Write a protein that binds this ligand. Structure first.
Ligand code: VM3
Ligand code: VM3
Length: 301
């Protein structure tokens, strides 16, 4: 972890970066702020290139599309909670998911949007904006406080509230027992495993393959080849995370490093070519009148 770059928000006595994601254009990072703005920064020079007020509440999530034509945002209390934007030449709104507080693109073919409203998931067409599916079964609900519905890498399976759904037939194929309050889980990029908190499950047997205690309460983020795995533990504008992140070998699940930046972490993401890790770290504390986040770029590398 060699530091390469650092910067704060331009013309702000209190920097308010809340989340980050690399743009499709190499050398440029996208950041949400607490004033619900989206900002394009040259990650090396720390120059602000563009800005736009997407919401009147803090950004909690953002996701650029791989072709750089579209972008998802999720705010805090502003209705609409989440929206889809276009960024071909001009920035503009395409659609708005009114009550969905968290949203993701499909992975293989990026033609659909998966939104989360508590325990319920909704799939939407990008072109038309229409609700195609609603995935929810009150009998199989685990009610994870931090549930995030998500597609597998081939877009034919969906994980929501600890239930694996077949999209084609829109039937719940398996329900995973609940062993924590908060984390709902992700697909491994190799699309053979499912990481639900400390438990790694096989998609072919539903057998427990690994117990990883160090992963407890981590929001997990992979590198783009899926050989490395970065976690930020939740706490027990307050940050969702504490001051340490952990790295793991993503094939055998052995720990590699536990960096403690000694500053609460807001978000953490990877470039397409597996050279860099951007991290939003807070110079303030919770009890500080204001946030003061910076963006640190480390090469891994
Ligand atoms: Cl386990 C988990 C899953 C998802 C989240 C969200 C989130 C919330 C938030 C609130 C305030 C400031 C920053 C953030 C943030 N930055 C990156 C993610 N988030 C997407 C809601 C948190 C924890
Ligand atoms: Cl938050 C936001 C606001 C506006 C934009 C656009 C944009 C994209 C772009 C891509 C590469 C290099 C420079 C730019 C640029 N500079 C100013 C406009 N843009 C109009 C899409 C993007 C994000």
């Amino acid at each position: 972890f060699r530091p390469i770059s650092v910067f704060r928000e331009a013309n702000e006595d209190e920097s308010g970066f809340t989340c980050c994601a690399f743009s499709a254009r190499e050398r440029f990072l996208m950041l949400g702020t607490c004033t619900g703005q989206l900002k394009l920064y040259n990650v090396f020079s720390g120059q602000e290139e563009a800005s736009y007020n997407c919401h009147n509440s803090a950004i909690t999530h953002l996701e650029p599309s791989r072709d750089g034509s579209l972008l998802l945002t999720s705010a805090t209390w502003s209705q609409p909670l989440s929206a889809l934007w276009g960024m071909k030449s001009v920035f503009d709104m395409k659609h708005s998911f009114t009550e969905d507080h968290y949203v993701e693109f499909s992975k293989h073919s990026q033609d659909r949007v998966i939104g989360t409203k508590g325990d319920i998931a909704h799939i939407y067409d990008i072109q038309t904006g229409n609700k195609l599916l609603t995935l929810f079964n009150p009998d199989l609900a685990n009610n994870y406080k931090r549930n995030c519905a998500t597609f597998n890498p081939t877009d034919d399976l969906v994980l929501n509230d600890g239930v694996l759904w077949d999209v084609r037939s829109a039937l719940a194929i398996h329900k995973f027992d609940k062993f924590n309050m908060n984390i709902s889980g992700v697909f491994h990029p190799n699309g053979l495993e499912v990481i639900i908190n400390t438990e790694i499950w096989d998609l072919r047997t539903f057998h427990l393959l690994h117990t990883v205690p160090a992963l407890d309460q981590c929001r997990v983020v992979f590198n783009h080849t899926g050989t490395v795995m970065y976690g930020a533990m939740l706490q027990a504008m307050k940050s969702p995370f504490g001051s340490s992140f952990r790295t793991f070998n993503a094939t055998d699940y052995k720990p590699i490093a536990t960096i403690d930046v000694k500053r609460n972490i807001f978000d953490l993401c990877t470039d397409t070519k597996d050279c860099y890790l951007a991290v939003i770290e807070n110079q303030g504390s919770m009890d500080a009148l204001n946030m003061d986040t910076v963006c640190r770029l480390y090469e891994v590398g």
